[PDB]
């Protein structure tokens, strides 16, 4: 896991997390959480079968 703050728009804060799975999560920054799932590699699914690193 790691925090991420865009180098230009300092207001932007986000959390990327991964595991032994084929999809990555991103949490933008309180009733609910805005979580986005990255699960598309655009034609390179063979080379990447886990996001854990």
């Amino acid at each position: 896991c790691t925090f991420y703050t865009s180098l230009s728009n300092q207001n932007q804060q986000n959390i990327f997390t991964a595991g032994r799975r084929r999809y990555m999560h991103s949490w933008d920054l309180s009733q609910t959480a805005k979580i986005e799932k990255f699960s598309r590699l655009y034609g390179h699914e063979s080379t990447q079968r886990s996001f854990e690193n």
Binding site: S26, E36, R40, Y42, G43
Partner: protein, 185 residues
């Protein structure tokens, strides 16, 4: 300009690419500067095979211009897409659509080409390796596509729902580019 058949404006809003009957010739012009001024007849881009075949192959149904002005995408009713490198009028064929392509739009950087047609399937062409990713089973055929954001956060689509032949039933979609899910329908 006279007798314009088709026209498009770059994503930045700074380049205009249009076709005129002066069969037909395509010219691109910069709007706020005189930096870009190019023209060429459509014959050069068209291959000879399409010259032999029927009219659907020589008939353009959509056009798009890259922001930097280096690349120009031309659709054809035959479903072929032809990317032209303006610097030397070199052609590159991307052929997936079985029917006429209705919407073309370059991304901001130019590496990705959004295409849509009667298939009800959106295709993102990766031009580096000519691969593609798909967003299928949309509610209707894609009349228009665009990349709307400083970093291409959102894709804006227009759908038609040609089932209802009585009326033109448009639906506007705004998709989040992260996971290709409808942010606003």
């Amino acid at each position: 300009w006279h007798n314009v058949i088709l026209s498009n404006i770059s994503s930045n809003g700074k380049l205009l690419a249009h076709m005129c009957k002066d069969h037909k010739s395509i010219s691109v012009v910069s709007l706020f500067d005189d930096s870009v001024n190019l023209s060429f007849p459509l014959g050069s881009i068209l291959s000879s095979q399409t010259q032999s075949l029927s009219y659907n192959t020589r008939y353009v149904s959509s056009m798009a211009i890259d922001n930097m002005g280096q690349q120009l995408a031309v659709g054809f009713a035959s479903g072929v897409i032809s990317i032209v490198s303006l610097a030397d009028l070199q052609i590159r064929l991307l052929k997936w659509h079985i029917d006429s392509v209705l919407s073309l739009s370059f991304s901001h950087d130019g590496s990705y080409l959004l295409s849509g047609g009667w298939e009800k399937v959106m295709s993102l062409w990766q031009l580096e390796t000519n691969s593609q990713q798909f967003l299928p089973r949309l509610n209707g055929i894609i009349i228009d596509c665009q990349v709307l954001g400083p970093q291409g956060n959102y894709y804006s689509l227009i759908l038609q729902m040609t089932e209802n032949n009585s009326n033109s039933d448009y639906q506007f979609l705004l998709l989040n580019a992260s996971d290709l899910t409808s942010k606003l329908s």
